[PDB]
Design a protein around this ligand. Structure first.
Ligand SMILES: Nc1ncnc2c1ncn2[C@@H]1O[C@H](CO[P@@](=O)(S)OP(=O)(O)OP(=O)(O)O)[C@@H](O)[C@H]1O
Ligand SMILES: Nc1ncnc2c1ncn2[C@@H]1O[C@H](CO[P@@](=O)(S)OP(=O)(O)OP(=O)(O)O)[C@@H](O)[C@H]1O
Lengths: 414, 414
């Protein structure tokens, strides 16, 4: 039988997301659909505008059967790490046969060809890559130029490689590359991205900031808007990066360069830039602009700020990017979802965590040969991120307790 | 020639402080007056309501000739550590002859008698203490009972040991004790504490919170009130603990018990209490009440919160409480003050820091047998505290830069 996996953030779940999910299901005709979803922080280094429990419920309402958390250590990395974590979780379920992602080109054959080269690492490609890195280009640029030069040597059209300047197709190549690395049999598919009625998740979050609520409503499915309003009515949203800005900036003034040198992703003089800009600027917005230069994107800097505040160190990320996620966290499922979750319990290659109050017992008793210390470090980060995030709920009445322990997986009858 | 030393916090400088300074000057008739003053955080675990540069200027205008900073590692400790740092700084100037402190008993002979016992550690006293250290008693209590039982054996009145339940006389004993430890020749004196026109510093900060400025005005010398208004009008005040509360509470959610176990001052299950209360409560006020129990003072809990965010570890404090402050930091001086500073350059036992941009050069060039690593760690903490505190200036425009480097010692002309 067929099971559709999808890799998602849903920050917030909007019409474009409904378009993807519906397209994916109609294309593949799966018996079940499983989503692996970023938690309370997304890949761009921002908080989710409402939390993962709310967004899990929306995913269920929109046609997902089971929602899994993509652990924080992957959810907040650049595309390579993000993709690797996401494919490991989907593959580890033991049931996912097909994955569909939105694509600018909608050219799956092109993406598979590129993923194969990056997987096999032919020496001519490596030679080109090394030269470009030596020339001082950043890895994404160097890889691009190296692939182009490789395409040319092969008598292919190198201009086709320009498709990899588009974010979603880059991610696509990384999903496929990850599946190749871990030996997964998952079939990958593209669907065409449309619009940016379809506003980007970032535009919609900006509409919320400006309190243009009618336009927000026009951008989201009804159940998504309803849950968004629910969270806002109870003071659990919206949550914006700028709400965390004074914390981040103040926290960096507590740290010296020695600290940042241990944090994953620091290189190219970024330790000194974090150290100096933290002391010379008075707001996180100004901080970001101070650290920012030609060779750094805002998303890279914002990711580094999250890695710093959560003390996500180099050794921990190295192990996570080698051994992968050590557990499957269930954020929610439907009555129909029970059926595929039951099969996962038989077929999964990682321990399944439903009841967080039990996760240490799950680890102690599992037959699966996981890395115990890595498991504990990974899930501790997931919990820490939730606990930190909840301090920024607008209403103080919502800031108590550990929501990973107090909120069980969302459940909806079918 | 006589130089009056005074140990002070001045948070803010009020009429009781003017009474003390006037009384001390009348008693000692000093040629010069040097204050050693807590920086931007005081001994009760709270931020100074305006910063150290403003309060140093107030001190000079009220008749102090030279203001020195009490380094943070001492300023934020309990009475023993606070006193030790303060007396070390004053003794290290090489010019201080007399120290006068406010006293509940105004009985200097008694305070001297108690410090002598603590310093000389009689056999009988040590026995009692070891007994009392068992039966679960914390040291300051076990000490009090050991002292009482000691007083009985010698045939003195043990009820008199209850004079040491009083805050100022506790400090008095510790100043004298510290002077004996380091072999200081400083003469200590008491003046009786008096108390309308006299409100405590805590009462005045609450008046400020409630915006009763006329009552604040009535509690403060004119120049003290004037500079308080200046800082407020210029967006550098007031600064209250509750302004830092969300930072502290959020920060504790980033930490596990292993972290608090390394922080100075943690014992008696306080690590578990910090950890659990941080996750169970939604505000720092609620956090503090959660941690509070009969055997804990709020001041101790508040101090521990400060040691936690500044990562003031057990070993760093143990060395500091052994070797003392490694530098004399000058916050301000008058014209008259320049004179005694000139003599200090010949007589001082620690390196003197005027220009913070030069402190590494000072440390490099000094012939004094300081601990260089400890010097660097102590002054790093002073700078960190200033930088952290400045993020809580009400005006965002005032939050940039490192004030320790941007603001030279205050110089007042006569
Ligand atoms: N307009 C659109 N058309 C088709 N597919 C889309 C889409 N928008 C998203 N998807 C697909 O929906 C899936 C989940 O999207 P995430 O939650 S990972 O958000 P994101 O893609 O970064 O959204 P953004 O910020 O608005 O660009 C992915 O396969 C998308 O390609
Ligand atoms: N009313 C008073 N009478 C006599 N001396 C006093 C005094 N108030 C302060 N002093 C003396 O002034 C000196 C500086 O006091 P800090 O700056 S250390 O403040 P603090 O004493 O904690 O003030 P509080 O919080 O208002 O009780 C000390 O020797 C005091 O004894």
């Amino acid at each position: 039988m067929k099971v559709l996996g999808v890799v998602v953030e849903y920050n917030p779940f909007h019409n474009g997301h409904l378009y993807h999910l519906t397209s994916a299901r109609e294309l593949v005709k799966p018996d079940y659909t499983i989503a692996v979803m970023s938690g309370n922080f997304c890949q761009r280094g921002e908080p989710a505008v409402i939390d993962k429990f709310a967004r899990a419920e929306i995913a269920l309402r929109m046609g997902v059967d089971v929602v899994l958390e993509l652990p924080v250590v992957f959810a907040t990395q650049d595309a390579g790490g993000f993709a690797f974590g996401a494919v490991c979780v989907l593959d580890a379920t033991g049931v996912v046969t097909d994955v569909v992602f939105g694509s600018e080109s909608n050219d799956i054959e092109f993406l598979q060809r590129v993923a194969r080269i990056l997987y096999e690492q032919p020496d001519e490609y490596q030679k080109f890559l090394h030269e470009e890195l030596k020339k001082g280009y950043s890895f994404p640029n160097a890889r691009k130029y190296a692939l182009m030069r490789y395409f040319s040597m092969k008598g292919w059209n190198e201009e086709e490689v320009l498709k990899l300047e588009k974010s979603n197709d880059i991610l696509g190549v990384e999903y496929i590359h990850s599946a190749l690395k871990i030996g997964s049999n998952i079939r990958f598919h593209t669907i065409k991205r449309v619009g940016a009625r379809f506003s980007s998740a970032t535009a919609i979050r900006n509409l919320m900031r400006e309190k243009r609520w009618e336009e927000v409503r026009d951008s989201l499915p009804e159940d998504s808007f309803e849950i968004l309003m629910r969270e806002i009515n109870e003071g659990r949203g919206p949550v914006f990066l700028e709400n965390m800005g004074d914390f981040l900036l103040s926290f960096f003034r507590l740290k010296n360069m020695d600290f940042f040198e241990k944090i994953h992703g620091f290189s190219e003089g970024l330790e000194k830039r974090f150290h100096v800009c933290a002391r010379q600027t008075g707001s996180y917005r100004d901080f970001l602009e101070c650290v920012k230069a030609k060779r750094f994107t805002f998303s890279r800097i914002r990711r580094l700020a999250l890695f710093s505040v959560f003390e996500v160190n180099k050794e921990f990320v190295e192990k996570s990017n080698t051994k992968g996620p050590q557990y499957i966290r269930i954020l929610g499922f439907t009555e129909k979802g029970r059926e595929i979750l039951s099969l996962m319990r038989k077929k999964a290659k990682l321990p399944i965590v439903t009841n967080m109050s039990l996760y240490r017992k799950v680890l102690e008793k599992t037959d699966l040969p996981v890395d115990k210390q890595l498991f504990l470090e990974q899930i501790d980060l997931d919990v820490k991120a939730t606990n930190f995030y909840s301090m920024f709920f607008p209403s103080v009445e919502q800031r108590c307790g550990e929501r990973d322990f107090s909120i069980h997986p969302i459940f909806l009858r079918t």
